[model samples]
Target: EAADVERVYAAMEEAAGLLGVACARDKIYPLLSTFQDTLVEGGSVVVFSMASGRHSTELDFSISVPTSHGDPYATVVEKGLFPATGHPVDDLLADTQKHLPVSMFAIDGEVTGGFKKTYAFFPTDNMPGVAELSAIPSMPPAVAENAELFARYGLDKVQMTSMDYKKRQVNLYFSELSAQTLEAESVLALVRELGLHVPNELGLKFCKRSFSVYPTLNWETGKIDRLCFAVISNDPTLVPSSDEGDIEKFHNYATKAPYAYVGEKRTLVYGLTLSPKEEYYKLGAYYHITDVQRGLLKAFD
Candidate 1:
C-alpha cells in the first residue's frame, strides 16, 4: 500500500510539472497517501491539470469513480471531504445526482501550484445533459456560452461537466451527433474568437465524434484564463483514429494501474486537448511542444 501511494505521488509530481504546477511537496505528501487510501474500490487517483507555465497555487490530486458503483455527494461528504455545511453548493452537490460521472479534488491554497486535496468531481455526460449546470438562472455565463457554441460544432449534447468555485470555471464534455468533424481552420476560428491558440506545426485537426471544451473567465479581467478544446474518442469501441490518443491519455491519467489496451501487445490513443494562453494563463498548452508535435502520445508513449 505504501508502495502504491508512493508510486502515484511520484507520477503525479512529474505530471504536475508538465501542467506547470509546482506543488508544495510537504503539504501534499500526507494528502497523497490519505486520498489513495480513502477512495472506493475500482477508483484511482487521477492527475489532470493545466500545462500553463505559471506558478499555480494548487496541483490537481483528483480521483475518478464510476457512478454506478456508488452515488454522488454521499461519497464526497460522507467521506469527510467537503464539510456538509448546507451551502447552496452543498445542496447542488447533494441534490444534483442520481448517476454521476465524476472526478473530485480538494482545492488547496495558491503558486505555479500548491495542493488541492479535496474530492474533485470531473463528470462525463454519462448520465444526463447540461441544462442543470447551464440553463439554471444562477449558473455561470460561460457554461451556457460554450454549451451553445459546441451545439453548432455538432457536439450539442453536453455530458461530463464540473465547476471549480475557486477558479470560477466549468467543463463541458460533448458527444457528436455524427455531425462531422470541423476543419482545423473552422475549430481555430472559434479558438481565435475566444483568443485561444494551438500549435500551428503539429498538423492537428478536429477528429472524432466528441470534443471537450472548458471555458472559464479570468473573473477579475473578464477574459479566459485557461481554455481546453479537446477532441475525444467515441468511447463506444475504439475505432482508432488520430483521436485515440486522448482515450489512452485519459485512461492512463485516470487510472492507478498500468495501461493496457484490449490486447496484450497493443495500445491505442484516445484524445487531444488544445489549451492556449489567456489572461491568467502563462504559457498555455496541454503538453510540451515536443510531445504535441510528436502527436498526442505522452513521454510514456
Candidate 2:
C-alpha cells in the first residue's frame, strides 16, 4: 500500500487546531517544508512539537533543523529556515558555533509571534558528567555552579547539553533517566530535590511517565528558567485495542484530541510542559520521521 500523505497532513492540521496553533501557510508551511527537506537531503531527524506558554492563546511551533551539507552554520542560514532576529546574526552564529559541530537547531515559534526563540544543541557523544560540561565555554559551569549537586548526579547517564539565546544559559535534557534511580538518585530526583515547584499532579504524573525531563536554569544564582517534562506515550502502553483519532487525555482540559497522526510508520510524542509561574502547565505534541525519501520527508508532516 502507498503512504497516506493526505491523511497524515489532515491529522497534523487537526492537531494544530486542537492545540490553538496557527496552521497558516506563512506561519507553518516554512517550518514543515524545511523539516521535510532535511529528513531526506540532510539525512537528519526532526521533531515538531507544541510551544506555548500557559497564558498564550496563539499557537507556537517548535522544531529541530539538522545540517548535512557544507558548513553547518552556513547550512542553517542558506536554508533560511531560521530567520534571524534584529540582533546581529553574527552574534547568534557565534553563540551557535560555541556549541559546534552544530548538531541541530531547536526553534520555538508563535506562528504569528514576531520571532522564535532559537536553541542550539551540542551533542556530547561522550555523555560526560560535571567535569566535562564545565570546560565547554557556553555551558553552565556544572561543577562550579553547584558542587554538591554535581557530585550527587550522574553525567555518565544519558544527557544532552544545549544553549538558549534567551538567557545565554545552558539547558540540560536528562533523558534515559527517572525521578528516582535504582543505582542512585537519578537526575530527575536531583533536579526535584532542588525544591522546584513542579505542579502537584504534574509532579506526581511526571514521575511515572517514561520520558525526558529538562530544566532550564542559572545554577549559580539559584535562579530557575523553566522546568520542562516530556509527557510522551508511544503505541498503547495498556490500550491494546485503541483506535485511531483517540484523544490522549492528559488532565481535565489538558488533552490532545484527534491525536492520531502516529502509527506503525511514524511515532508522535506529547510533552506536558510547565514553567516557573503561578498555576501553570501546557501540553506539547511532537511528530517524528521514521521513513525518509527524496527531498522531503515521506513519513509526512
Candidate 3:
C-alpha cells in the first residue's frame, strides 16, 4: 500500500501525455524528495504540492467545445474535472474534503469567477442592433451626468440588447457604466427609474463595493442577445463592494438567476453556474486586463 504514492506520479504522467510535455520524474522526484527530506531535517515531512493551470481549463472550454464547433484540432488541452463523488485522479490525488470522515476540514463554498463567462443569448432583432454601455448612462442622467465621467472612473462598455417590437428589429447594443457601478445604489435606482427592467433572472455583481449586472447573454424569440459588462479598477486586488459580506456572497450574482425587461418582448436573461471547492477562490482571476483588452481589440480588428 505504501507503493501507492507512485500513482501520483503516474497521474501526472497521464496528464502530461495530453500536452505533449516531458516528465523527468526520475530527475525531478529525487530532487523533490531530497527537498522534503531537508524540510524534515528538524523532523516533519512537509510536502508542498504545486501545479500550473492551463488555458482550456481556465476557459471552461472543455465542456462547451464539443457542443459548439466540434473537436478542437488535437491540440493540447488542460482541465480539472469536479466529479460528484471522486477526484478525477483518485488513485493519486484525492479530494478528502468531499469524503472527510471528520467535519474539521469540511468546507463547502460556492464556485467563483463565473462573472467572466457568457451565460445567455437572445435574438438580435429583440435587442439593440448596436449600442454600447457608454450609452447606458445617457438613458439616465443622474448616475453619470456625462459620458466622460465613465471614462474617468474606469468604466467599460457593457453591451445589452432589446428588440423594437413592430420592426421586430434585432438589437445589438452596449452601455457605458462606471466599473464600480455594478451594484451601485445609484445605478440600480437609475435602471428602475428609467423603466428599463433588469431581467429578474440576471444576478447582480459588484466592483469596488458597487453592484452591477453580470456578464450575461439571453436567448428568446430565436435571436441572440448578449450582455458583457466592462469593469476596471485602479487597484487590481480590490473586489467591488456593495455589501461588507459581498466577499463571501460571490454566488449571489454570478449564479444562473433570471432577469427580464419590463414591457418589451418580456425578454429573459441567464447566467452561468458552476461547482466550487472548499470556498477557496484564491486562484480565480480578479484580473482580466489582457482578456478584456483582447475582447475590445477584436471588435476593431
Candidate 4:
C-alpha cells in the first residue's frame, strides 16, 4: 500500500514542473514522515483545478479526502472538513470524477492515476487528506512587513493586518478577535469597526468571518495599485457557518455590479480573497470581469 501511495505521488511529481505546480519532495516528505502510519490502506486525495491561473482570484476547485479508517465521507464530517453550509460528502464523491475531478488515488496494492491536469493532492493525517491549493496572489512588501510585525508583536496583540497584490491593485485584511473563536455578530461588528477606520477612498470588501480588504489607488492614474487584508482564520476546516454566507455574498457583488466608486477615484471592486486560515493555499475571485476599472470593461462586454 505504501508503495502504491508512493507511485501516485510520483505520478504527480512527473507533471509538477510542466504544470507550474509545486510538489517538492522536501515539502511532502515531512507530511509523509508524520502521517504515514495513519493513512488509510486504500485512501485517496482528489485534486481539482483552481479557476484560471493560480494567481486569479476565483475559488472554483474542489477536493476529495482519503483517510485512515477507509470511510472518507464520515471522516469529512468528523474532521470538520467542509466550510459553512457544508454539503453532503456523498454528493461530493458521487460525481468525484465529474464535479471536482479526482486526479489520482492510492490503494493497498495499486495507485490509480487519472486524466492529466494541472492539479496536485495533499496527503494529511486528518480523515481523508485535505486539498490544500490556494488562490491568494503573492504578498507585496507592505503586506509582508505587516505579517512580520504580527509574527513579532501583533500576533499576541488584538488585531493584525497585511496586503495582497493582483493586477497591481492593493487591498488589506484585518483581524478583530484576541484569540481564535468563531462568532458571527462579533465578526460583523469587527468589520464595521475596520471599515470605519479607513476612508471610503479605498474600495472595501470582506470575506469569511473576520477578514477585510481595502484596495489602494494610484492618485495620478486613478488605478488601484495595492490590496491589503487580514489573516483571521488559521484553518479553512474551522471557519464558522455564518462566515460562509459572507464569501458567497462577496461573490455575488463582484459579478453583478461594476466597479464601485470610492471618493473621487473609481475603484474596481471584485471579490478577491485568499484563505485566511490556509497559508498560500486558497485564492478566490468572485463575479469579476476582466480589468473593468481602467478601460477593460468593453473587452469583457
Residue range 1-301, candidate 3, lDDT tens digits: 2232343234334433333345655443432232221221111111111112222222111011111321111111111212222212121111212221111110011112111111112222332212232133212222233334333433344333221212222222234444445454544443443333342222244222322233212222222222223332222223233234433333332221111111211111112111111111211211112233233334322
Model 2: residues with Cα > 4 Å off, grouped in runs = 1-13, 30-36, 39-48, 51-58, 70-107, 114-125, 140-144, 155-158, 166-169, 182-193, 198-202, 218-222, 235-279, 291-301
Q: TM-score winner among the candidates?
A: 2
Question: Positional deviation of 147 in candidate 2, in angstroms?
Answer: 5.2
In model 4, which runs have C-alpha deviations exceeding 4 angstroms? 11-19, 41-190, 194-301
Q: Candidates' lDDT values, in order?
A: 0.41, 0.45, 0.25, 0.28
Candidate 4 C-alpha lDDT tens digits along 201-280: 11222332323333342213432343334322212222111345434533333233221122222222222322222212
Q: How well does model 4 score by local distance difference test?
A: 0.28
Estimate TM-scores for all models: 0.54, 0.61, 0.23, 0.23
The segments of candidate 3 whose C-alpha lies over 4 angstroms from its true place after superposition are: 1-186, 193-217, 221-229, 234-237, 242-245, 248-301
The true-versus-predicted C-alpha distance at residue 264 of model 4, in Å, is 50
Full ranking by lDDT: 2, 1, 4, 3
Tens digits of lDDT, candidate 1, 1-301: 7775666556555665443346665655654454455332233324234322233334444444444445434544565543454333344343334244444333332223333222334433343455555544434455555555555555455544554544544444443334343455556666676566553433243332223444444223434454544432212233222345443433443332222121322222233344465322211112111112133233223
For model 2, residues 1-301, the per-residue Cα lDDT tens digits are: 0123333345456666765555665655554554454433123333434433334455544545654432333433567755443333324444445534455555554545422455555554644444544555544544356545635653233345454433455555665553453122352465466655445533444444535556565534555556555544433221111223222333211334343334433344444444444323344443433233121222222
Q: Residue 192's C-alpha lDDT in candidate 2?
A: 63
| Superposed Cα deviation of residue 142, candidate 3 (Å) | 27
- Alpha-carbon error at 193 in model 4, in Å? 2.7
Q: After superposition, how far is residue 216 of candidate 3 from its true place, in Å?
A: 4.4
Model 4, 243: alpha-carbon shift in Å?
Answer: 23
